[PDB]
Coordinates of C-alpha atoms and ligand atoms in Angstrom, one line a residue:
Chain A
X10 CA 92.4 -35.6 -99.4
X11 CA 94.9 -37.5 -97.3
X12 CA 94.8 -34.9 -94.6
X13 CA 91.1 -35.0 -94.1
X14 CA 91.1 -38.7 -93.3
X15 CA 94.3 -38.4 -91.2
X16 CA 92.5 -35.8 -89.1
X17 CA 89.6 -38.2 -88.6
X18 CA 92.0 -41.0 -87.9
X19 CA 93.7 -38.9 -85.2
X20 CA 90.3 -37.9 -83.7
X21 CA 89.3 -41.6 -83.5
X22 CA 92.5 -42.5 -81.7
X23 CA 92.1 -39.5 -79.4
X24 CA 88.6 -40.6 -78.3
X25 CA 89.6 -44.3 -78.1
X26 CA 93.1 -44.4 -76.7
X27 CA 93.3 -41.1 -74.7
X28 CA 89.8 -40.7 -73.4
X29 CA 88.9 -44.4 -73.4
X30 CA 85.6 -44.3 -75.3
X31 CA 84.0 -47.7 -75.9
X32 CA 83.8 -49.4 -79.3
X33 CA 80.0 -49.3 -79.0
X34 CA 79.9 -45.6 -78.1
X35 CA 82.1 -44.6 -81.1
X36 CA 80.2 -47.0 -83.4
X37 CA 76.8 -45.5 -82.8
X38 CA 78.4 -42.0 -83.1
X39 CA 79.7 -42.9 -86.5
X40 CA 76.4 -44.7 -87.3
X41 CA 74.6 -41.3 -86.8
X42 CA 76.9 -39.6 -89.3
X43 CA 78.8 -37.7 -86.6
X44 CA 82.5 -37.3 -87.4
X45 CA 85.0 -37.8 -84.6
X46 CA 86.9 -34.7 -85.8
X47 CA 84.0 -32.5 -84.8
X48 CA 83.7 -34.2 -81.4
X49 CA 87.3 -33.5 -80.5
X50 CA 86.9 -29.9 -81.6
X51 CA 83.9 -29.3 -79.4
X52 CA 84.2 -26.1 -77.5
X53 CA 82.2 -27.2 -74.4
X54 CA 82.0 -30.4 -72.5
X55 CA 78.3 -30.3 -72.9
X56 CA 78.8 -30.3 -76.7
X57 CA 81.4 -33.0 -76.3
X58 CA 79.1 -35.3 -74.3
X59 CA 76.1 -34.6 -76.5
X60 CA 77.8 -35.6 -79.7
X61 CA 79.5 -38.5 -78.0
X62 CA 76.0 -39.7 -76.9
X63 CA 76.7 -40.3 -73.2
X64 CA 74.9 -39.0 -70.2
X65 CA 75.8 -35.4 -69.5
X66 CA 77.6 -34.8 -66.2
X67 CA 76.3 -32.2 -63.7
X68 CA 78.5 -30.1 -61.5
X69 CA 80.8 -30.7 -59.8
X70 CA 82.9 -32.5 -62.4
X71 CA 86.7 -32.5 -63.0
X72 CA 86.2 -31.5 -66.6
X73 CA 84.8 -27.9 -66.8
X74 CA 85.1 -24.6 -68.4
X75 CA 88.3 -23.6 -66.6
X76 CA 90.4 -26.4 -68.1
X77 CA 88.5 -27.3 -71.3
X78 CA 90.8 -25.6 -73.8
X79 CA 93.9 -27.5 -72.7
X80 CA 92.0 -30.8 -72.4
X81 CA 90.9 -30.3 -76.0
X82 CA 94.2 -29.0 -77.4
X83 CA 96.4 -31.4 -75.5
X84 CA 94.4 -34.4 -76.7
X85 CA 94.4 -33.2 -80.3
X86 CA 98.2 -32.7 -80.1
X87 CA 98.7 -36.0 -78.4
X88 CA 96.6 -37.9 -81.0
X89 CA 98.4 -36.4 -84.0
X90 CA 101.7 -37.9 -82.9
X91 CA 100.0 -41.1 -81.9
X92 CA 98.8 -41.6 -85.5
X93 CA 102.3 -41.1 -86.9
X94 CA 103.3 -43.7 -84.3
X95 CA 100.9 -46.2 -85.7
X96 CA 101.7 -45.3 -89.3
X97 CA 105.3 -46.1 -88.6
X98 CA 104.4 -49.7 -87.7
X99 CA 102.7 -50.0 -91.1
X100 CA 99.1 -49.6 -89.9
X101 CA 96.5 -47.7 -91.9
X102 CA 93.1 -46.6 -90.7
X103 CA 90.4 -46.9 -93.4
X104 CA 87.2 -44.9 -92.8
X105 CA 83.7 -45.7 -94.0
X106 CA 82.9 -43.2 -96.8
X107 CA 86.5 -43.1 -98.1
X108 CA 87.8 -44.5 -101.5
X109 CA 89.8 -47.2 -99.8
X110 CA 86.7 -48.7 -98.0
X111 CA 85.5 -51.9 -99.7
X112 CA 82.0 -51.9 -101.2
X113 CA 81.2 -55.4 -100.0
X114 CA 81.1 -54.2 -96.4
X115 CA 78.2 -51.9 -97.2
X116 CA 76.1 -55.0 -97.7
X117 CA 76.0 -55.2 -93.9
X118 CA 73.2 -53.7 -91.9
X119 CA 76.0 -52.6 -89.4
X120 CA 79.0 -51.8 -91.6
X121 CA 82.3 -51.1 -89.8
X122 CA 82.8 -47.3 -89.8
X123 CA 86.5 -47.7 -89.5
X124 CA 89.1 -50.4 -90.1
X125 CA 92.7 -50.8 -89.0
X126 CA 94.8 -52.4 -91.7
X127 CA 98.3 -53.8 -92.0
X128 CA 99.5 -55.1 -95.4
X129 CA 97.7 -55.2 -98.8
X130 CA 94.4 -53.4 -98.6
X131 CA 93.6 -54.0 -102.3
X132 CA 92.7 -57.6 -101.5
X133 CA 89.4 -56.4 -100.0
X134 CA 88.3 -55.2 -103.4
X135 CA 89.1 -58.5 -105.2
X136 CA 87.7 -62.1 -105.1
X137 CA 87.9 -63.6 -101.6
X138 CA 87.0 -67.1 -100.3
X139 CA 86.3 -67.5 -96.6
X140 CA 87.6 -70.7 -94.9
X141 CA 86.5 -71.0 -91.3
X142 CA 85.6 -73.6 -88.7
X143 CA 85.8 -74.9 -85.2
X144 CA 88.7 -74.0 -83.0
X145 CA 89.0 -77.7 -82.1
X146 CA 89.0 -79.6 -85.4
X147 CA 89.5 -83.3 -86.0
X148 CA 92.4 -84.6 -88.1
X149 CA 90.2 -84.7 -91.2
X150 CA 89.0 -81.1 -90.7
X151 CA 92.6 -80.0 -90.7
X152 CA 93.2 -81.8 -94.0
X153 CA 90.0 -80.7 -95.7
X154 CA 91.0 -77.1 -94.9
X155 CA 94.3 -77.5 -96.8
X156 CA 92.6 -79.5 -99.6
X157 CA 90.0 -76.8 -100.1
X158 CA 92.4 -74.0 -100.3
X159 CA 94.7 -75.8 -102.7
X160 CA 91.8 -75.7 -105.2
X161 CA 92.3 -71.9 -105.5
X162 CA 95.9 -72.0 -106.5
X163 CA 96.6 -69.7 -109.5
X164 CA 93.1 -68.3 -109.1
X165 CA 92.5 -64.6 -108.6
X166 CA 91.2 -65.3 -105.1
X167 CA 92.6 -64.6 -101.7
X168 CA 91.6 -66.3 -98.5
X169 CA 89.8 -64.8 -95.5
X170 CA 89.9 -66.2 -92.0
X171 CA 89.8 -65.1 -88.4
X172 CA 93.3 -66.0 -87.1
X173 CA 92.0 -68.2 -84.4
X174 CA 93.0 -71.7 -83.2
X175 CA 92.0 -74.6 -85.3
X176 CA 90.5 -74.4 -88.8
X177 CA 91.3 -70.6 -89.1
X178 CA 95.0 -71.1 -88.3
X179 CA 95.1 -74.1 -90.7
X180 CA 93.5 -71.9 -93.4
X181 CA 96.2 -69.2 -93.1
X182 CA 99.0 -71.8 -92.9
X183 CA 97.6 -73.5 -96.0
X184 CA 97.3 -70.2 -97.9
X185 CA 100.9 -69.3 -97.0
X186 CA 102.1 -72.7 -98.1
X187 CA 100.4 -72.5 -101.5
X188 CA 101.3 -68.8 -101.9
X189 CA 97.7 -67.6 -101.9
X190 CA 97.4 -64.1 -100.2
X191 CA 95.4 -64.4 -97.0
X192 CA 93.4 -61.9 -94.9
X193 CA 93.2 -62.3 -91.1
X194 CA 90.2 -60.6 -89.5
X195 CA 91.0 -60.2 -85.9
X196 CA 88.8 -60.5 -82.8
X197 CA 91.1 -58.1 -81.1
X198 CA 92.9 -54.8 -81.6
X199 CA 96.1 -54.8 -83.5
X200 CA 98.3 -54.6 -80.4
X201 CA 97.2 -57.9 -78.9
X202 CA 99.3 -61.0 -78.9
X203 CA 96.3 -63.3 -79.2
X204 CA 96.3 -66.0 -80.3
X205 CA 99.5 -67.5 -78.9
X206 CA 102.5 -67.2 -81.3
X207 CA 100.6 -65.0 -83.7
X208 CA 103.3 -62.3 -84.4
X209 CA 105.3 -64.5 -86.7
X210 CA 102.2 -65.7 -88.7
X211 CA 101.0 -62.1 -89.0
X212 CA 104.5 -61.3 -90.2
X213 CA 104.5 -64.0 -92.9
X214 CA 101.0 -63.1 -93.9
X215 CA 102.1 -59.5 -94.5
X216 CA 105.4 -60.6 -96.1
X217 CA 103.5 -62.7 -98.6
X218 CA 101.2 -59.9 -99.8
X219 CA 98.5 -60.6 -97.2
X220 CA 96.5 -58.4 -94.9
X221 CA 95.7 -58.0 -91.2
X222 CA 92.3 -56.4 -90.6
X223 CA 90.4 -55.4 -87.5
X224 CA 87.4 -53.2 -86.6
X225 CA 88.5 -53.0 -83.0
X226 CA 90.5 -50.3 -81.3
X227 CA 94.3 -51.0 -80.8
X228 CA 94.1 -52.3 -77.2
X229 CA 90.8 -54.2 -77.3
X230 CA 91.2 -57.7 -75.7
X231 CA 89.7 -60.9 -77.2
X232 CA 86.2 -61.8 -76.2
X233 CA 83.4 -64.2 -77.3
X234 CA 81.4 -61.1 -78.2
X235 CA 84.3 -59.7 -80.2
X236 CA 84.5 -62.9 -82.2
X237 CA 80.8 -63.1 -83.2
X238 CA 80.8 -59.4 -84.0
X239 CA 83.8 -59.8 -86.2
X240 CA 82.3 -62.7 -88.2
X241 CA 79.9 -60.3 -89.9
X242 CA 83.0 -58.8 -91.5
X243 CA 84.3 -62.2 -92.5
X244 CA 81.0 -63.1 -94.1
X245 CA 80.8 -59.8 -95.9
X246 CA 84.3 -60.1 -97.3
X247 CA 83.8 -63.7 -98.4
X248 CA 82.4 -63.9 -101.9
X249 CA 82.3 -67.6 -101.2
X250 CA 82.2 -69.0 -97.7
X251 CA 83.6 -72.4 -97.0
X252 CA 82.9 -73.7 -93.5
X253 CA 85.1 -76.7 -93.3
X254 CA 84.2 -78.3 -89.9
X255 CA 81.6 -76.8 -87.6
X256 CA 78.6 -77.5 -85.4
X257 CA 75.3 -75.7 -85.4
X258 CA 74.8 -73.2 -82.6
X259 CA 78.5 -72.6 -82.9
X260 CA 80.5 -69.5 -83.7
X261 CA 80.9 -70.5 -87.3
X262 CA 77.2 -71.0 -87.7
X263 CA 76.8 -67.3 -87.1
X264 CA 79.1 -66.6 -90.0
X265 CA 77.3 -69.1 -92.2
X266 CA 74.0 -67.6 -91.4
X267 CA 75.3 -64.1 -92.1
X268 CA 76.7 -65.3 -95.4
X269 CA 73.2 -66.6 -96.2
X270 CA 71.7 -63.3 -95.3
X271 CA 74.3 -61.5 -97.5
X272 CA 73.5 -64.0 -100.3
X273 CA 77.1 -65.2 -100.5
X274 CA 77.8 -68.5 -102.1
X275 CA 78.3 -71.3 -99.6
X276 CA 80.3 -74.4 -100.3
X277 CA 80.6 -77.4 -97.9
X278 CA 83.6 -79.8 -98.2
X279 CA 82.7 -83.5 -98.2
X280 CA 85.4 -86.1 -98.4
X281 CA 84.8 -88.7 -101.1
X282 CA 82.6 -91.6 -100.0
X283 CA 81.4 -90.0 -96.8
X284 CA 77.9 -89.0 -95.7
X285 CA 76.8 -85.3 -95.3
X286 CA 76.2 -84.4 -91.7
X287 CA 73.2 -82.4 -90.6
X288 CA 75.1 -79.1 -90.5
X289 CA 75.8 -79.7 -94.2
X290 CA 72.2 -80.8 -94.8
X291 CA 71.1 -77.7 -92.9
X292 CA 73.1 -75.5 -95.3
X293 CA 71.6 -77.2 -98.4
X294 CA 68.2 -76.9 -96.9
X295 CA 68.3 -73.3 -95.6
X296 CA 71.1 -71.4 -97.2
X297 CA 71.0 -73.1 -100.7
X298 CA 74.6 -74.3 -100.1
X299 CA 76.5 -76.7 -102.4
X300 CA 78.6 -79.8 -101.8
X301 CA 82.2 -79.5 -102.8
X302 CA 83.6 -83.0 -103.2
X303 CA 87.2 -83.4 -101.9
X304 CA 88.7 -84.5 -104.1
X305 CA 86.8 -82.8 -106.9
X306 CA 88.7 -85.2 -109.2
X307 CA 87.5 -88.7 -109.8
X308 CA 89.6 -91.8 -109.6
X309 CA 89.1 -92.2 -113.3
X310 CA 91.5 -89.2 -113.7
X311 CA 94.1 -91.2 -111.8
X312 CA 93.6 -94.3 -114.0
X313 CA 94.2 -92.2 -117.1
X314 CA 97.7 -91.4 -115.8
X315 CA 98.7 -94.9 -114.4
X316 CA 97.8 -96.8 -117.6
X317 CA 98.7 -94.4 -120.4
Chain B
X10 CA 99.7 -128.6 -96.0
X11 CA 99.7 -126.3 -93.0
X12 CA 102.1 -128.6 -91.1
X13 CA 104.8 -128.7 -93.8
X14 CA 105.1 -124.9 -93.7
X15 CA 104.9 -124.7 -89.9
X16 CA 107.9 -127.2 -89.8
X17 CA 109.8 -124.9 -92.1
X18 CA 108.8 -121.9 -90.0
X19 CA 110.0 -123.6 -86.9
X20 CA 113.3 -124.5 -88.6
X21 CA 113.9 -120.9 -89.7
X22 CA 113.2 -119.7 -86.2
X23 CA 115.5 -122.4 -84.8
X24 CA 118.5 -121.3 -87.0
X25 CA 117.8 -117.6 -86.6
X26 CA 116.7 -117.1 -82.9
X27 CA 118.4 -120.1 -81.2
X28 CA 121.6 -120.5 -83.1
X29 CA 122.0 -116.9 -84.3
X30 CA 122.4 -117.5 -88.1
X31 CA 122.7 -114.3 -90.1
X32 CA 120.1 -113.0 -92.5
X33 CA 122.6 -113.3 -95.3
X34 CA 123.6 -116.8 -94.4
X35 CA 120.0 -118.0 -94.4
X36 CA 119.1 -116.1 -97.5
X37 CA 121.8 -117.7 -99.6
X38 CA 120.8 -121.1 -98.1
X39 CA 117.2 -120.6 -99.3
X40 CA 118.5 -119.1 -102.6
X41 CA 120.2 -122.5 -103.3
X42 CA 116.9 -124.4 -102.7
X43 CA 118.0 -125.8 -99.4
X44 CA 115.2 -126.1 -96.9
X45 CA 115.8 -125.1 -93.3
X46 CA 113.9 -128.2 -92.1
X47 CA 116.6 -130.4 -93.5
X48 CA 119.4 -128.3 -92.0
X49 CA 117.9 -128.7 -88.5
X50 CA 117.5 -132.4 -89.0
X51 CA 121.1 -132.9 -90.1
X52 CA 122.6 -135.9 -88.3
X53 CA 126.2 -134.5 -88.2
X54 CA 127.7 -131.1 -87.5
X55 CA 129.6 -131.5 -90.8
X56 CA 126.3 -131.9 -92.6
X57 CA 124.8 -129.0 -90.6
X58 CA 127.7 -126.7 -91.5
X59 CA 127.9 -127.8 -95.1
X60 CA 124.2 -127.1 -95.8
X61 CA 124.4 -123.9 -93.8
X62 CA 127.3 -122.8 -96.1
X63 CA 129.7 -121.8 -93.3
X64 CA 133.3 -122.8 -92.9
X65 CA 133.5 -126.2 -91.3
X66 CA 135.1 -126.3 -87.9
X67 CA 137.9 -128.6 -87.0
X68 CA 138.5 -130.3 -83.7
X69 CA 138.5 -129.3 -80.9
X70 CA 135.0 -127.8 -81.0
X71 CA 132.3 -127.7 -78.4
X72 CA 129.7 -129.1 -80.8
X73 CA 130.6 -132.7 -81.6
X74 CA 129.4 -136.2 -82.0
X75 CA 128.9 -136.7 -78.2
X76 CA 126.3 -134.0 -77.8
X77 CA 124.9 -133.7 -81.3
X78 CA 121.6 -135.5 -80.8
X79 CA 120.5 -133.3 -77.9
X80 CA 121.7 -130.2 -79.6
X81 CA 119.5 -131.1 -82.6
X82 CA 116.5 -132.4 -80.7
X83 CA 116.5 -129.6 -78.1
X84 CA 116.6 -126.9 -80.7
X85 CA 113.8 -128.5 -82.7
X86 CA 111.7 -128.8 -79.6
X87 CA 112.5 -125.3 -78.5
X88 CA 111.6 -123.8 -81.9
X89 CA 108.3 -125.6 -82.1
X90 CA 107.0 -123.8 -79.0
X91 CA 108.7 -120.6 -80.2
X92 CA 106.5 -120.6 -83.3
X93 CA 103.3 -121.0 -81.3
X94 CA 104.6 -118.1 -79.3
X95 CA 104.8 -115.9 -82.4
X96 CA 101.5 -117.3 -83.8
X97 CA 99.8 -116.1 -80.6
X98 CA 100.9 -112.5 -81.2
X99 CA 99.2 -112.7 -84.6
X100 CA 102.4 -113.2 -86.7
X101 CA 102.5 -115.4 -89.8
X102 CA 105.5 -116.6 -91.6
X103 CA 105.0 -116.8 -95.4
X104 CA 107.5 -118.9 -97.3
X105 CA 108.7 -118.5 -100.9
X106 CA 107.0 -121.3 -102.9
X107 CA 103.9 -121.4 -100.8
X108 CA 100.4 -120.4 -102.0
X109 CA 100.3 -117.3 -99.7
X110 CA 103.5 -115.9 -101.3
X111 CA 102.7 -112.9 -103.6
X112 CA 103.6 -113.3 -107.3
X113 CA 104.8 -109.7 -107.6
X114 CA 107.9 -110.5 -105.4
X115 CA 109.1 -113.1 -107.9
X116 CA 109.8 -110.2 -110.3
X117 CA 112.8 -109.5 -108.1
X118 CA 116.2 -110.9 -108.9
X119 CA 116.5 -111.5 -105.2
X120 CA 113.0 -112.4 -104.0
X121 CA 112.5 -112.7 -100.2
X122 CA 112.4 -116.4 -99.3
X123 CA 110.4 -115.8 -96.2
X124 CA 108.2 -113.0 -94.8
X125 CA 106.9 -112.2 -91.3
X126 CA 103.4 -110.9 -91.5
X127 CA 100.9 -109.3 -89.1
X128 CA 97.4 -108.4 -90.4
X129 CA 95.8 -108.8 -93.8
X130 CA 98.1 -110.8 -96.1
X131 CA 95.6 -110.7 -99.0
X132 CA 96.6 -107.1 -99.7
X133 CA 99.9 -108.2 -101.2
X134 CA 97.9 -109.9 -104.0
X135 CA 95.8 -106.8 -104.9
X136 CA 96.5 -103.3 -106.3
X137 CA 99.0 -101.4 -104.3
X138 CA 100.4 -97.8 -104.6
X139 CA 103.7 -97.0 -103.0
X140 CA 104.1 -93.6 -101.4
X141 CA 107.6 -92.9 -100.1
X142 CA 110.0 -90.1 -99.6
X143 CA 112.6 -88.4 -97.5
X144 CA 112.7 -88.8 -93.8
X145 CA 112.9 -85.0 -93.5
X146 CA 110.2 -83.5 -95.7
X147 CA 109.2 -79.9 -96.1
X148 CA 105.7 -78.7 -95.1
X149 CA 104.7 -79.1 -98.8
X150 CA 106.0 -82.6 -99.0
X151 CA 103.8 -83.6 -96.0
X152 CA 100.7 -82.1 -97.7
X153 CA 101.4 -83.6 -101.1
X154 CA 101.6 -87.1 -99.5
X155 CA 98.1 -86.7 -98.0
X156 CA 96.8 -85.2 -101.2
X157 CA 98.2 -88.0 -103.3
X158 CA 96.7 -90.7 -101.1
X159 CA 93.3 -89.0 -101.0
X160 CA 93.0 -89.6 -104.8
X161 CA 92.8 -93.3 -104.1
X162 CA 89.7 -93.1 -101.9
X163 CA 87.1 -95.8 -102.8
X164 CA 89.6 -97.3 -105.2
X165 CA 90.6 -101.0 -104.9
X166 CA 94.1 -99.9 -104.0
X167 CA 96.0 -100.2 -100.7
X168 CA 99.1 -98.1 -99.8
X169 CA 102.6 -99.4 -99.2
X170 CA 105.3 -97.5 -97.3
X171 CA 108.2 -98.2 -95.0
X172 CA 107.1 -97.0 -91.6
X173 CA 109.9 -94.5 -91.3
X174 CA 110.1 -90.9 -90.2
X175 CA 108.8 -88.3 -92.6
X176 CA 107.0 -89.0 -95.8
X177 CA 106.4 -92.7 -95.0
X178 CA 104.8 -91.9 -91.6
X179 CA 102.7 -89.2 -93.3
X180 CA 101.7 -91.8 -95.9
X181 CA 100.5 -94.3 -93.3
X182 CA 98.8 -91.5 -91.3
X183 CA 97.0 -90.4 -94.4
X184 CA 95.9 -93.9 -95.4
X185 CA 94.4 -94.4 -92.0
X186 CA 92.7 -91.1 -92.0
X187 CA 91.0 -91.8 -95.4
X188 CA 90.4 -95.5 -94.4
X189 CA 92.6 -96.9 -97.2
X190 CA 94.3 -100.1 -96.0
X191 CA 98.1 -99.6 -95.7
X192 CA 101.1 -101.9 -95.7
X193 CA 104.2 -101.1 -93.7
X194 CA 107.4 -102.8 -94.9
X195 CA 109.8 -102.7 -92.0
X196 CA 113.6 -102.2 -92.0
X197 CA 113.7 -104.2 -88.8
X198 CA 112.4 -107.4 -87.3
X199 CA 108.9 -107.5 -85.9
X200 CA 110.1 -107.1 -82.3
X201 CA 111.8 -103.7 -82.7
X202 CA 110.3 -100.5 -81.3
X203 CA 111.7 -98.5 -84.2
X204 CA 110.6 -95.9 -85.2
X205 CA 109.7 -94.0 -82.0
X206 CA 106.1 -94.5 -81.0
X207 CA 105.4 -97.1 -83.7
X208 CA 103.5 -99.6 -81.6
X209 CA 100.2 -97.7 -81.7
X210 CA 100.4 -96.9 -85.4
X211 CA 101.2 -100.6 -86.2
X212 CA 98.1 -101.3 -84.0
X213 CA 95.9 -99.0 -85.9
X214 CA 97.2 -100.2 -89.2
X215 CA 96.3 -103.8 -88.2
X216 CA 92.9 -102.7 -86.7
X217 CA 92.0 -101.0 -90.0
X218 CA 92.7 -104.0 -92.2
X219 CA 96.3 -103.2 -92.9
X220 CA 99.5 -105.3 -92.8
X221 CA 102.9 -105.2 -91.2
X222 CA 105.5 -106.9 -93.3
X223 CA 109.2 -107.7 -92.9
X224 CA 111.8 -110.0 -94.4
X225 CA 114.0 -109.6 -91.4
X226 CA 114.4 -112.0 -88.4
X227 CA 112.5 -111.0 -85.3
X228 CA 115.3 -109.2 -83.4
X229 CA 117.1 -107.6 -86.3
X230 CA 117.9 -103.9 -85.5
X231 CA 117.4 -101.0 -87.9
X232 CA 120.3 -100.2 -90.2
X233 CA 121.0 -98.2 -93.4
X234 CA 121.7 -101.5 -95.2
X235 CA 118.4 -102.9 -93.9
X236 CA 116.5 -100.0 -95.3
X237 CA 118.0 -100.1 -98.8
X238 CA 117.6 -103.9 -98.9
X239 CA 113.9 -103.5 -97.8
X240 CA 113.1 -101.0 -100.6
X241 CA 113.4 -103.7 -103.3
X242 CA 110.3 -105.2 -101.5
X243 CA 108.5 -101.9 -101.5
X244 CA 109.2 -101.4 -105.2
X245 CA 108.1 -104.9 -106.1
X246 CA 104.8 -104.6 -104.2
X247 CA 104.1 -101.1 -105.6
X248 CA 102.1 -101.5 -108.8
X249 CA 102.5 -97.7 -109.0
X250 CA 105.3 -95.9 -107.1
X251 CA 104.7 -92.3 -106.0
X252 CA 107.9 -90.8 -104.6
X253 CA 106.5 -87.5 -103.1
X254 CA 109.6 -85.7 -102.0
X255 CA 113.1 -87.0 -102.5
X256 CA 116.6 -86.2 -103.7
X257 CA 118.7 -88.2 -106.0
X258 CA 121.4 -90.3 -104.5
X259 CA 119.0 -90.8 -101.6
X260 CA 117.4 -93.8 -100.1
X261 CA 114.2 -93.3 -102.1
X262 CA 116.1 -93.0 -105.4
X263 CA 117.0 -96.7 -104.9
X264 CA 113.4 -97.5 -104.6
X265 CA 112.5 -95.5 -107.7
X266 CA 115.4 -97.0 -109.7
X267 CA 114.2 -100.5 -108.7
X268 CA 110.6 -99.6 -109.6
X269 CA 112.0 -98.6 -113.1
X270 CA 113.9 -101.9 -113.3
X271 CA 110.7 -103.8 -112.3
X272 CA 108.8 -101.7 -114.9
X273 CA 106.4 -100.4 -112.4
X274 CA 104.4 -97.2 -113.2
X275 CA 106.0 -94.1 -111.6
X276 CA 104.0 -91.0 -110.8
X277 CA 105.5 -87.8 -109.5
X278 CA 103.4 -85.2 -107.6
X279 CA 103.7 -81.6 -108.8
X280 CA 101.7 -78.8 -107.1
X281 CA 99.8 -76.7 -109.5
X282 CA 101.8 -73.8 -110.9
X283 CA 105.2 -75.1 -109.8
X284 CA 108.2 -76.1 -111.8
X285 CA 109.5 -79.8 -111.9
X286 CA 112.7 -80.3 -110.1
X287 CA 115.6 -82.3 -111.6
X288 CA 114.6 -85.4 -109.6
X289 CA 111.2 -85.2 -111.4
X290 CA 112.9 -84.4 -114.7
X291 CA 115.3 -87.4 -114.1
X292 CA 112.3 -89.7 -113.7
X293 CA 110.6 -88.5 -116.9
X294 CA 113.9 -88.9 -118.7
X295 CA 115.1 -92.2 -117.4
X296 CA 112.2 -94.1 -116.0
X297 CA 109.4 -92.9 -118.2
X298 CA 107.7 -91.4 -115.2
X299 CA 104.5 -89.2 -115.4
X300 CA 103.6 -85.9 -113.7
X301 CA 100.6 -86.2 -111.4
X302 CA 99.2 -82.7 -111.0
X303 CA 98.1 -81.8 -107.4
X304 CA 95.3 -80.9 -107.6
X305 CA 94.3 -83.1 -110.6
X306 CA 91.2 -80.9 -110.8
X307 CA 91.3 -77.5 -112.6
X308 CA 90.0 -74.3 -111.1
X309 CA 87.3 -74.5 -113.8
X310 CA 85.7 -77.2 -111.7
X311 CA 85.5 -74.9 -108.7
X312 CA 84.0 -72.1 -110.9
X313 CA 81.2 -74.6 -111.9
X314 CA 80.2 -74.9 -108.3
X315 CA 80.4 -71.3 -107.2
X316 CA 78.3 -69.9 -110.0
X317 CA 75.7 -72.5 -110.6
Ligands
CL1 CL1 83.7 -41.6 -88.9
CL2 CL1 113.0 -122.0 -97.4

């Protein structure tokens, strides 16, 4: 069974890394039920380009009948070693339709048809709580992030965030601090160094039983489109979504909307004694969200301790 | 009534700032019930030095009968303006035996006989929770400090700490963030810039209804002896003492010991699922301390919200 998916893995890397096929091109290929293995084993360039869904080239073209066999065989041979190269770094490619693929992602209209993974894949199949927010939080947003995640200590939950500046990085840092496994869904390929000084955090995430996850091909750069596209994954994986600090018509609003479309539970942190803002009121109105008081405790619980 | 204490204030400043009398010398003076006003109005140097408790000088000495009147009158005149100078900066001098002096400090064997104050003095008479710890905390100590103080939101408590690097600064920063009035007890005189970038925090403390407090004379530098001496104040003011992160045979252990001697309530933060350390076990053994779980909430309270 292993060898079937490894052949599809190598075909994906062949088209992506060697021939440079776009994410979108390969996505709609897989969306149609076309397997990359049968694209790379095409015996003509016409067949190649038909299955790949691009505009067929006329003559003259540098790819032709005279050099097709080597073009095909050399790319298959190249990609087979390239996958062992990525396996050696601890990366796994999880394909849609395989046993390792998590059910939750098939709630999406556009499920990822492949995933690059580094770390503990079994977390995708277990309870997850998304913690996400602005890349430019206030001091209180940073605290609420940690306070929220501390509530899940010794639960069966892991955390999910996007490894981005601000709330997301504070979410991962908090999960690590409290020894909650955390999942980072990237807006890049696995090879990128974004965000700054990310290689150590990714290391600690993996060392603490966490997971690095991305739908994007190894060398895909960060982009505003890549982030919004990735947030459908974050919403789908989040059994509960907790947007800590966020404005409407923001990145995180997309995630919250998606979570509402996916009928995920939505909790909104509110510090004791403070007034909900319209983004919170929006979530209670639209998405049937729920306030989560921080602290959840009352001061009466503190009084019990002081005066025994 | 105001003018009686202002005269004692000016006499204290006269001896301290003009003539350079030590903290300890003036402390034992006041400990005996000698008022500084009557020292500065002494008509001989023999009387001056007898009341001040120092070794009486023989002749020849530059202070003598021929220049005594001016020495006395010029220092009284100088100090009267010097107090208006400190009043203008918002400083108040609170004397032991005056209505503004807080009762809690008379639980000390060695109560401060004067206090310099900037901000809201009425906090000393109300519920206070001390939050103190090492100057070199771990990441978790910094969080626990904030989590502990968040429990007192919308309580009638203010916070008390020593405005020192580490836990103390995180305690003040947390109180400010959650809008809990905070009291900083200095290990210096009010004129010092210690610790680094302290003038803005002192400003925000005062602007948020907080208080700066010190027993030390205006230009007293920081010292390890000044810090341990000041922690008897912090213990006395703390109706509840919460040492967040601390080793035994540390600065903060002195405070905790004192708090035990003063029979203050002692709470010790313990993150959920973690084992008490011997410093915590020491406090439960000796000082009848109590664990305060962080969070105080259970995960069952989170489950209630998720699945309504
Ligand atoms: Cl596929
Ligand atoms: Cl006095």
